[PDB]
Design an enzyme around this catalytic site. Structure first.
Site, PDB file in Angstrom:
ATOM      1  N   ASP A   1      -4.403 -13.099   3.410  1.00 58.68           N
ATOM      2  CA  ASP A   1      -5.710 -12.583   3.827  1.00 58.68           C
ATOM      3  C   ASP A   1      -6.812 -12.960   2.837  1.00 58.68           C
ATOM      4  O   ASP A   1      -7.949 -12.572   3.042  1.00 58.68           O
ATOM      5  CB  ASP A   1      -5.689 -11.071   4.137  1.00 58.68           C
ATOM      6  CG  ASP A   1      -4.853 -10.260   3.195  1.00 58.68           C
ATOM      7  OD1 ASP A   1      -4.377 -10.729   2.121  1.00 58.68           O
ATOM      8  OD2 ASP A   1      -4.665  -9.072   3.565  1.00 58.68           O
TER       9      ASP A   1
ATOM     10  N   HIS B   1       0.796  -1.216   0.000  1.00 58.84           N
ATOM     11  CA  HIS B   1       0.000   0.000   0.000  1.00 58.84           C
ATOM     12  C   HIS B   1       0.832   1.271   0.000  1.00 58.84           C
ATOM     13  O   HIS B   1       0.276   2.361  -0.134  1.00 58.84           O
ATOM     14  CB  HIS B   1      -1.015   0.043   1.142  1.00 58.84           C
ATOM     15  CG  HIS B   1      -2.003  -1.074   1.097  1.00 58.84           C
ATOM     16  ND1 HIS B   1      -2.849  -1.264   0.023  1.00 58.84           N
ATOM     17  CD2 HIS B   1      -2.228  -2.105   1.949  1.00 58.84           C
ATOM     18  CE1 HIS B   1      -3.574  -2.354   0.235  1.00 58.84           C
ATOM     19  NE2 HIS B   1      -3.229  -2.873   1.402  1.00 58.84           N
TER      20      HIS B   1
HETATM   21  N1  LIG Z   1     -13.756  -3.778   7.299  1.00 60.54           N
HETATM   22  C1  LIG Z   1     -12.567  -2.956   7.413  1.00 60.54           C
HETATM   23  C2  LIG Z   1     -11.311  -3.819   7.405  1.00 60.54           C
HETATM   24  C3  LIG Z   1     -10.065  -2.977   7.664  1.00 60.54           C
HETATM   25  N2  LIG Z   1      -9.860  -1.961   6.645  1.00 60.54           N
HETATM   26  C4  LIG Z   1      -8.582  -1.271   6.517  1.00 60.54           C
HETATM   27  C5  LIG Z   1      -7.410  -2.177   6.844  1.00 60.54           C
HETATM   28  C6  LIG Z   1      -6.238  -2.067   5.869  1.00 60.54           C
HETATM   29  C7  LIG Z   1      -5.903  -3.472   5.378  1.00 60.54           C
HETATM   30  C8  LIG Z   1      -4.531  -3.456   4.732  1.00 60.54           C
HETATM   31  C9  LIG Z   1      -4.041  -4.842   4.360  1.00 60.54           C
HETATM   32  O1  LIG Z   1      -4.184  -5.855   5.026  1.00 60.54           O
HETATM   33  N3  LIG Z   1      -3.460  -4.874   3.182  1.00 60.54           N
HETATM   34  O2  LIG Z   1      -2.908  -6.009   2.618  1.00 60.54           O
HETATM   35 ZN   LIG Z   2      -4.103  -7.477   2.478  1.00 57.62          ZN
END
Ligand SMILES: NCCCNCCCCCC(=O)NO
Ligand SMILES: [Zn+2]
Ligand SMILES: NCCCNCCCCCC(=O)NO
Ligand SMILES: [K+]
Ligand SMILES: [K+]
Ligand SMILES: [N+]
Ligand SMILES: [N+]
Ligand SMILES: [Zn+2]
Lengths: 341, 341
Positions: free
Chosen positions: A284, A159
């Site tokens: 993930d 990111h």
């Molecule tokens: N329902 C909202 C879940 C969390 N939202 C922002 C988290 C950023 C995730 C970044 C990541 O894991 N990138 O690979």
């Molecule tokens: Zn991720």
């Protein structure tokens, strides 16, 4: 297969993450590295080595110098300004704003941030430099002739764009690794981002470049973080025309569908003529991931690693996301089993 | 002069504001309106009336319809999504992002937000509509021939741009009032923003319009919120060429300096030929204001009101910021004394 890993990841041990309007302990926490390291060793990948340290030579070719200078002093400046929490941006340069860079820490943290859930904490910069170093040493193994290596990066990288941090990321490790491979003599490299989230930072870094092909499979940004990049229509500009390939997918996506996008991405990479592939590996995509909506199973990661390695070109696997359960380790180790088998 | 004020401001009573990496009680709290109302009454301004309700006719001419639709349901959608805190954006459409609008609540709250310190809470939309109504009724009094009126708006408005909320603001009350005056027959109107902070929302709304002159005196955005607009070089675009005038000023600025910028702004407004001036009045220029760096004294507010009224054109005073201490009321009342004297 060598595993590069720095204990200095632990220097990033942030207290807070803004999630659901609350400041909660972060999803991207040091226990992730513990779980992943233990699982890769359990799977027989016990050739684990610390990275050599590296300066900024390679990273300056993918990140803006002002941005890197900002990260180096952000914590010190936040603390000196008298703020009591961790360093969290609030104002952002959104639609129809001035392009100017503020001078104070509150303005600058917003200028250099794409996502406020990610706090800067003491030790963050050092941790990020150690994670970058693991990616660089992994790249150097590939450049020297290995066909596979695993850089156990933490914090993750995908990111982080040219000049912005967010999504738990500060230095784009995969981008640095790709640049390192070019610096060591490659002319064409691909980054394949299989993390559930779009690698918007990676896309940004190479969007106008034709030396690095970027492919990403991810939750549709219409309904997933990072929300503002990752649509299929984004294929590249200028010298980067035709070298970004995004595969956004919807809720509940299983391997039977996700793997079809993987096959297509690998065709795109082969037609581009990548000399090596840097795999931005987030797990993930797992059916039990607490913040994600794909339905991959643990056995699917073996299939994934095998399919990517069947490209017949060298792979550097770079760790990105995957949260919540220690099976994140099994899932990463399974990708490595597929690569090594 | 008449004071327009709605008790429905209290429907906005948010519990949290992100400040210094912590969630703290908001500065822009219901007790502000109580302090201000009491002080204006004490100063002899006791002709206080509730606004008539208004629909969206006027506001649709200054704010985007998708944005207004988003605000109407944002709280309900946030709560339905299972989040435990108040509704706070974290991802933002910053540099080099897609222009597309996400579909889910997390993506949309970021799309429609310029500043994450401002949480959406239950009652926020209704409160914002009541505050807009106070501005519209004030404008209608000016349109009908009054030379001064005070709209005691809360929540404030000047950080709300065409399609983004932030800085404690949701509907740009001053912009709505200016539009209302045009709708009632004016051809040229000015907004004069004397709040400490740049009225970036107001600037955005009128930047490409030549019917409303926008002037703002404010903390230099290089070192003050909103950080990303408010530089002197910003003078307008297209039909708005030459009708934005920003006066950024530094730390410790006292009235002897600030008043010189006021004189210049009024010269500009007179040359433009404004038929009325909507004054975006924040008293966060006060030497005790907890979040601001100017050094105005309570007597300076009388001078300010007198000087603005010496333009000889009708004024609508619209409440913006000013925090922390009950003297915010004295300061507002003093501007009104200067206008009425
Ligand atoms: N329902 C909202 C879940 C969390 N939202 C922002 C988290 C950023 C995730 C970044 C990541 O894991 N990138 O690979
Ligand atoms: Zn991720
Ligand atoms: N050092 C941080 C102080 C708070 N920073 C942003 C607050 C937003 C102020 C909005 C306002 O009062 N506008 O009139
Ligand atoms: K991805
Ligand atoms: K102002
Ligand atoms: N690219
Ligand atoms: N304007
Ligand atoms: Zn203000």
């Amino acid at each position: 297969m060598r595993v590069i890993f720095s204990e200095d990841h632990k220097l990033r041990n942030a207290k807070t993450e803004l999630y659901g309007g609350e400041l909660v302990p972060p999803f991207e926490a040091p226990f992730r590295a513990e779980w992943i390291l233990a699982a890769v060793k359990e799977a027989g990948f016990d050739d684990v080595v610390a990275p050599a340290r590296h300066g900024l030579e390679t990273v300056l070719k993918v990140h803006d110098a002002g941005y890197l200078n900002f990260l180096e002093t952000a914590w010190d400046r936040w603390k000196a300004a008298g703020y009591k929490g961790e360093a969290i941006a609030t104002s952002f340069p959104v639609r129809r704003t001035s392009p100017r860079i503020p001078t104070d820490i509150e303005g600058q943290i917003g200028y250099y941030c794409n996502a406020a859930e990610t706090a800067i904490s003491p030790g963050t910069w050092e941790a990020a430099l150690s994670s970058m170093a693991s990616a660089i040493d992994g790249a150097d193994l590939i450049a020297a002739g290995h066909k596979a290596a695993f850089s156990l990066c933490r914090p993750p990288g995908h990111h982080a764009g040219i000049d912005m941090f967010g999504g738990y990321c500060f230095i784009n490790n995969a981008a640095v690794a790709a640049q390192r491979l070019l610096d060591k003599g490659a002319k064409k490299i691909a980054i394949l981002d299989v993390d559930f989230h779009h690698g918007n930072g990676t896309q940004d870094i190479f969007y106008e470049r034709g030396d690095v092909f970027f492919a990403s499979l991810h939750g549709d940004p219409a309904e997933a973080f990072p929300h503002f990049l990752g649509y299929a229509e984004e294929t590249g500009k200028g010298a980067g025309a035709g070298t970004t390939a995004n595969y956004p997918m919807g809720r509940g996506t299983p391997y039977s569908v996700w793997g079809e996008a993987l096959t297509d991405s690998l065709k795109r990479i082969a037609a581009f003529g990548a000399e090596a592939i840097v795999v931005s590996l987030g797990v993930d995509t797992f059916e039990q991931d607490p913040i994600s909506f794909f339905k991959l199973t643990s056995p699917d990661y073996i299939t994934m690693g095998r399919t990517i390695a069947a490209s017949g070109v060298p792979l550097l696997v770079v760790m990105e996301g995957g949260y919540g359960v220690p099976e994140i380790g099994l899932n990463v180790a399974n990708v490595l089993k597929g690569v090594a088998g």
